[PDB]
């Protein structure tokens, strides 16, 4: 249980990352 | 076989991410 | 107490990656 | 020796989606 | 110290891919 605590913890932020990494894609299409 | 379930249940999102960026990228292409 | 050292370790630099991408991405709206 | 297999055959596909990664950014000069 | 090895393995060519992409990401700036 406190293993897969540790590994939801990074996904946790991760999911921040990716999804302002397709936003930040998206954004570049700005024309 | 418990640890390799949450090795993969990482990846199974991971491959929609990628995925993901591929098709960003490649719609980056709109010209 | 080591385990979680080691994977907080990674995430350090990892913060360092991430900024800097989101960094260059908007850098590259330069226009 | 389990272990590292394991590791390994993240990488695996993991030079993939790297490989990619760089083909696409270049493709993007498309200029 | 086997398991710190391993992760410091991935992390080495990691420093690569980082690198490159930064590298990559700034070349697309050729304007």
Same mark, same amino acid.
């Given at each position: 249980?406190?293993?897969? %605590?540790?590994?939801?913890?990074?996904?946790?932020?991760?999911?921040?990352?990716?999804?302002?990494?397709?936003?930040?894609?998206? %954004?570049?299409?700005?024309?």
């Amino acid at each position: 249980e406190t293993g897969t %605590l540790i590994v939801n913890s990074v996904l946790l932020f991760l999911a921040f990352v990716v999804f302002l990494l397709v936003t930040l894609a998206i %954004l570049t299409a700005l024309r």
